[PDB]
Amino acid sequence: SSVVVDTNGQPVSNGADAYYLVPVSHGHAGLALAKIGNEAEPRAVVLDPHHRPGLPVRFESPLMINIIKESYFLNIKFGPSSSDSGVWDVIQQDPIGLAVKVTDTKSLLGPFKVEKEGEGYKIVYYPERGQTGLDIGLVHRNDKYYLAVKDGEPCVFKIRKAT
């Protein structure tokens, strides 16, 4: 339940700033969108070796505070803070599994937390707020790493402010 901190030692803000999620294992990959299954438009969140540092994210809580604690339930989103598109969610979808995808809607309390893990942070997804969480990890397919629930095998990120 400590404050989430970026690579500069500053508290991660609530919505005001965008941040790159920088993998510590992958090194040459950044967040991007990819097609999943039969879909025309890319809606699955992936780590793409060709796209570094990748698309930046915003961390959003309805609480009226400008810092993010590891205990806060968060929405994570691509794009502008106020915009309702690019909001992350978890969708069961073959062939990835419990796939991280973007939608055009934003729920009040998001299902994600950011938790200290090893030498960085991991993303953890909660199917309901009362429950234990599921680490977000990577499913290697089509020369990219689909972000998906992979409990016990989290992807570890440092949080680098886009500036």
Partner 1 sequence: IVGGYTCGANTVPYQVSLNSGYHFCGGSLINSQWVVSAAHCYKSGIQVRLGEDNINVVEGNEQFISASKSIVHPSYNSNTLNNDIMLIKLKSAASLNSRVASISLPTSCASAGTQCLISGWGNTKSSGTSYPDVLKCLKAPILSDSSCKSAYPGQITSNMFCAGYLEGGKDSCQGDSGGPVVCSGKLQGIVSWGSGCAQKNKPGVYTKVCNYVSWIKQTIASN
43 vs 69, beta carbon nearer partner 1: 69
Question: Cα–Cα distance between 20 and 146 in angstroms, integer?
Answer: 17
Q: Is the peptide bond before 49 cis (omega within 30 degrees of 0)?
A: no
Among 82, 85, 92, 142, binds partner 1 (CB under 8 A): 82
| One character per residue 88-127, x = contact with partner 1 (rule: CB under 8 A) | --------------------x-------------------
* CB 113 to partner 1: min, Å: 10
Q: What Å distances lie between residue 89 and 56, 98, 104, 105, 129, CA to CA?
A: 16, 10, 10, 10, 14
Question: 50 or 65, CB closer to partner 1?
Answer: 65
Determine if 162 is a binding residue for partner 1 (CB under 8 A). no
Task: Give the C-alpha distances (Å, rounded to integers) separating 87 from 99, 106, 123.
Answer: 13, 6, 14
In the block, tokens 């969610």 appear at: 89
Contact status: 24 vs partner 1 (CB under 8 A): no
Q: How many CB atoms lie within 10 A of CB 106?
A: 16
Q: Which of 35, 37, 50, 62 binds partner 1 (CB under 8 A)?
A: 62
Binding site for partner 1 (CB under 8 A): 3, 11, 14-16, 62-67, 69, 71-73, 81-82, 108, 129-130
